Amino acid sequence: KPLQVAAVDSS
Amino acid sequence: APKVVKFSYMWTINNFSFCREEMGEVIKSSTFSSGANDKLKWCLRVNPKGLDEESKDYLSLYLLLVSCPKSEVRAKFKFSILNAKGEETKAMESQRAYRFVQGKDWGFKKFIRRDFLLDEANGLLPDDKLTLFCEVSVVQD
């Protein structure tokens, strides 16, 4: 699994 | 010409290993603002154990517009972790400006895998503290 995912979203 | 105000905030989460086990925990920073003196208050929001099942292996990190009396504010943002030497690492930026309204956040559901964070060799929880650095660039109408 990626260490970090740079996809931006809103909670 | 858009008019842009840059500001930042450093947040240390102490006693990181005392975060709740059950999923759903939210931790928030104190509020912060630019000098622009426009009534906008922001904070950081962390889910130490992810927002949901798909993200349970990650820490999630968001920028929240806590207070804003105007309809909307656009802002770019960047988050970094400060390592055991005080330097920025593992940063991610939003790239473009996102549209905030009061109570809205934007950020990274999968900011960093927790097993990397908890591996002492990476030096990211020195003394059981997680230090995060947020830089914001807000558009002022």
Author numbering:
A (entry chain B): -2 to 8
B (entry chain A): 26 to 166
Article excerpt on this structure:
The adaptor protein, speckle-type BTB/POZ protein (SPOP), recruits substrates to the cullin-3-subclass of E3 ligase for selective protein ubiquitylation. SPOP recruits substrates via its N-terminal MATH domain, whereas a central BTB domain mediates dimerization and interactions with Cul3. Here, we show that MyD88 interacts with SPOP through a long degron that contains the established SPOP-binding consensus and an N-terminal site that we name the Q-motif. We determine the structural basis of these interactions and show that the Q-motif interacts with an unexplored binding pocket on the SPOP MATH domain.
MyD88 interacts with SPOP through a sequence (134VDSSV138; MyD88 SBC) located between the death- and TIR domains. The side chain of MyD88 Val134 is buried in a hydrophobic pocket that is contributed by SPOP residues Phe102, Tyr123, Trp131, and Phe133, whereas the side chains of MyD88 residues 135DSS137 are involved in hydrogen bonding with the side chains of SPOP residues Tyr87, Lys129, and Asp130. The side chains of MyD88 Leu129 and Gln130 sit in a hydrophobic pocket that is contributed by SPOP residues Phe136, Ile137, and Phe141, with the side chain of Gln130 also forming hydrogen bonds with the backbone carbonyl groups of SPOP Lys115 and Phe136. The +5 residue of the MyD88 SBC (Val138) differs from the defined consensus. MyD88 Val138 cannot make these contacts, and instead, the backbone NH group of MyD88 Arg140 forms a hydrogen bond with the side chain of SPOP Asp77, thereby directing the C-terminus of the MyD88 peptide in a different direction from that observed in other SPOP substrates. Of note, the Cα B-factors of the C-terminal MyD88 residues, 138VPR140, were relatively high, and these residues were not modeled in a crystal structure of SPOPMATH in complex with a longer MyD88 peptide (128PLQVAAVDSSVPRTAELAG146). This suggests that the residues located C-terminal to the SBC are highly flexible, as observed in structures of other SPOP substrates.
